[PDB]
Amino acid sequence: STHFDVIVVGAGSMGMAAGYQLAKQGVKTLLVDAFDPPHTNGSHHGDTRIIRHAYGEGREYVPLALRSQELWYELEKETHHKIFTKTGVLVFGPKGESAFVAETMEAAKEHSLTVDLLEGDEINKRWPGITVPENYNAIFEPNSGVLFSENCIRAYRELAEARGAKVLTHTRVEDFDISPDSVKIETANGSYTADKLIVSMGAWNSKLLSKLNLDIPLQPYRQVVGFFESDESKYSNDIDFPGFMVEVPNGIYYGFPSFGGCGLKLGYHTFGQKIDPDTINREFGVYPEDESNLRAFLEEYMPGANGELKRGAVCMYTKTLDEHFIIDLHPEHSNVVIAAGFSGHGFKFSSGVGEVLSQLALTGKTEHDISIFSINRPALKESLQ
Numbered sequence: 231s232t233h234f235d236v237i238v239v240g241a242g243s244m245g246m247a248a249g250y251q252l253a254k255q256g257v258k259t260l261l262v263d264a265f266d267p268p269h270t271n272g273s274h275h276g277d278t279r280i281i282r283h284a285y286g287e288g289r290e291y292v293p294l295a296l297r298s299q300e301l302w303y304e305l306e307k308e309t310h311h312k313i314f315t316k317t318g319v320l321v322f323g324p325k326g327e328s329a330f331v332a333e334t335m336e337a338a339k340e341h342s343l344t345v346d347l348l349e350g351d352e353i354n355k356r357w358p359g360i361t362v363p364e365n366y367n368a369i370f371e372p373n374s375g376v377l378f379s380e381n382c383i384r385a386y387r388e389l390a391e392a393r394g395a396k397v398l399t400h401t402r403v404e405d406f407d408i409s410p411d412s413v414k415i416e417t418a419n420g421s422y423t424a425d426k427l428i429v430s431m432g433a434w435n436s437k438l439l440s441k442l443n444l445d446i447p448l449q450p451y452r453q454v455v456g457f458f459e460s461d462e463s464k465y466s467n468d469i470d471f472p473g474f475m476v477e478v479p480n481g482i483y484y485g486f487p488s489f490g491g492c493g494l495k496l497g498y499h500t501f502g503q504k505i506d507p508d509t510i511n512r513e514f515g516v517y518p519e520d521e522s523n524l525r526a527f528l529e530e531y532m533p534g535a536n537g538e539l540k541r542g543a544v545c546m547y548t549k550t551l552d553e554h555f556i557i558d559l560h561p562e563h564s565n566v567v568i569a570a571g572f573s574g575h576g577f578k579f580s581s582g583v584g585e586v587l588s589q590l591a592l593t594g595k596t597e598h599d600i601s602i603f604s605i606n607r608p609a610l611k612e613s614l615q
């Protein structure tokens with residue numbers, strides 16, 4: 231018997247940030263999650279996430295990255311949980327052979343971002359522990375870094391709840407009923423109604439958006455990361471080893487310096503198993519490539535960070551065909567907002583996306599330029615049932 235102003239379905243990276251933005255404004259909000267965020271069944275665990283500003287996926291993401299960075303610094307001031315460490319982010323690849331490195335460089339120039347350009351042995355000399363061929367070049371962004379993602383979600387949740395937001399946990403939304411003047415969700419624990427709906431179900435958007443009459447190609451991928459015993463005199467955040475995202479002939483890899491001796495963390499970005507979020511095997515090591523694809527990179531490029539595997543994690547990316555996000559109103563329902571398809575690179579923007587989703591839910595518009603995330607764009611291949 232409790233109506234809400236806004237209901238957020240999926241209180242993860244995007245939904246919890248939206249919940250915080252709504253609650254801060256006195257908007258009566260209900261967030262419903264299938265688990266209890268932060269958790270290890272979605273796309274936000276594994277402890278850390280890179281935030282970059284010079285953006286290799288496209289210079290058009292820069293304003294949102296800069297606003298998100300500002301919001302993360304604000305969050306750091308509002309909570310006792312650790313939010314951000316300014317490790318800097320190193321991007322490298324073979325000279326003239328990486329579109330990712332080239333666009334990162336162009337984005338930095340176009341937006342006057344502070345970066346260092348170096349190549350070959352200059353890279354190996356600046357950061358003991360990295361061994362790249364002499365024909366590699368790099369761009370280092372000193373002022374970007376690493377986010378503690380589970381801490382971010384935990385902090386937004388605590389702040390939102392303190393302002394009155396309600397979070398209904400361990401409750402899966404199974405269906406939606408949308409009318410011109412209201413929205414309704416159905417769950418085994420009861421049905422709830424509101425004036426507006428934000429849908430941010432992560433990998434499950436690939437299975438449940440059909441309940442909103444949407445047909446959009448979305449593919450969930452199983453993406454693992456491993457933490458390795460490393461030479462702390464080289465790979466520790468305390469000696470300024472950077473976060474990194476790099477392109478080599480067989481793909482893109484990313485990693486993090488060892489924090490408090492946890493070991494260097496590495497992931498392989500361009501390969502993952504196609505999976506379903508309800509049947510994915512979340513145990514690290516069940517496929518031999520989980521660990522072998524990581525050591526193939528380490529033994530060649532960061533040889534002193536290739537010791538015993540200390541910890542592994544299994545997480546999911548949800549890709550669109552063009553690998554750009556979907557942030558927009560439902561084409562048939564202005565009272566429904568969709569946040570989907572973050573394609574393995576959305577966490578850094580979650581603070582800014584929370585702001586955008588709040589604006590879309592409350593006003594049907596946003597001050598942010600989100601045209602490239604349109605649900606009606608040709609490359610997405612969206613349609614109705």
Ligand SMILES: *Cc1cc2c(cc1C)nc1c(=O)[nH]c(=O)nc-1n2C[C@H](O)[C@H](O)[C@H](O)COP(=O)(O)OP(=O)(O)OC[C@H]1O[C@@H](n2cnc3c(N)ncnc32)[C@H](O)[C@@H]1O
Pocket residue numbers: 239240241242243244245262263264265267271272273274276278279280281401402403404430431432433434435438453454455484497545546547569570572573574575576577578579
């Ligand atoms: C997995 C991964 C992702 C990743 C990364 C490394 C790995 C291994 N590294 C990144 C990085 O360094 N920098 C960055 O910017 N992004 C990086 N990513 C991607 C990023 O983590 C994802 O893009 C982001 O987390 C996506 O957020 P989203 O909010 O879409 O997904 P979520 O956090 O999983 O939250 C979804 C929530 O919805 C709930 N849910 C699902 N179904 C239901 C139903 N039916 N009812 C209610 N709730 C539902 C989930 O339980 C979850 O909490």
Ligand SMILES: O=C(O)c1ccco1
Pocket residue numbers: 447448449549550551
């Ligand atoms: O394989 C993919 O990456 C995919 C399929 C549909 C959307 O993305």
Ligand SMILES: O=C(O)c1ccco1
Pocket residue numbers: 279280281282475484485499574575576578
């Ligand atoms: O910055 C990103 O988007 C990232 C780093 C590692 C994986 O994704």
Ligand SMILES: [Cl-]
Pocket residue numbers: 273546547548549571572573574575576
């Ligand atoms: Cl994703």
